[PDB]
Amino acid sequence: SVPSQKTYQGSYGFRLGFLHSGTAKSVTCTYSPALNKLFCQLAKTCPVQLWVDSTPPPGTRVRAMAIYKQSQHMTEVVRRCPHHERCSDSDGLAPPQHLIRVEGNLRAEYLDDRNTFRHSVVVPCEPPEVGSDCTTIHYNYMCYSSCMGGMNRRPILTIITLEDSSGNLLGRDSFEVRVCACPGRDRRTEEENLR
Ligand SMILES: c1ccn(-c2oc(C3CC3)nc2-c2nnn[nH]2)c1
Ligand SMILES: [Zn+2]
């Protein structure tokens, strides 16, 4: 009833990477290594690098899923709030209830788990382009952390899993996410609080 969040590089040396976007007031997505926390604006591009030490098999996939970070909320499905699930901002592929979308990939698949009712979005692994050492996926988060009747100010984690063609676990990594109006300011504030 609770997805694992244990970091696991596995046989292929799987791990995430994040850009260095800084903390200017205008920044739309920014990652804090000290907090292991991504700060982003609503529905804006969040680039996440997918690193491996060795090539996984054809048919390997990468899945993203959100869970609540606090243990007392972890069995609750993370979903869009009663406003945003109804605001008709469909991209033609993501169900309107899903918090996490993949941008610009027609092979993205959206799962409503028939047993756990959790949402996830999964894409096929592709080889890096010539000149690149990794591929990058672009996520969008479709509700604010503060949305009433939804996340309601509760922090979430995103869990990224590398899966074989059956859905078996090959690798796992994760990061906290705050979806907010001013990611640069909030990253600076939280890093200062940590210090
Ligand atoms: C996301 C995570 C791994 N991959 C990946 O998939 C593949 C072929 C199976 C398609 N090669 C890579 C690779 N990435 N960096 N180097 N090689 C995509
Ligand atoms: Zn919302």
From Swiss-Prot:
Reported effect, W51R: In sporadic cancers; somatic mutation
Effect after changing C40T: In a sporadic cancer; somatic mutation; requires 2 nucleotide substitutions
Effect of mutating Q70P: In sporadic cancers; somatic mutation
Listed result of changing L194V: In sporadic cancers; somatic mutation
Effect recorded for P57A: In sporadic cancers; somatic mutation
Effect annotated for changing R15L: In a familial cancer not matching LFS; germline mutation and in sporadic cancers; somatic mutation; does not induce SNAI1 degradation
Annotated consequence of substituting S120T: In sporadic cancers; somatic mutation
Outcome after substituting R178N: In a sporadic cancer; somatic mutation; requires 2 nucleotide substitutions
Effect on the protein of changing Y141F: In a sporadic cancer; somatic mutation
Protein name in UniProt: Cellular tumor antigen p53
Native species: Homo sapiens
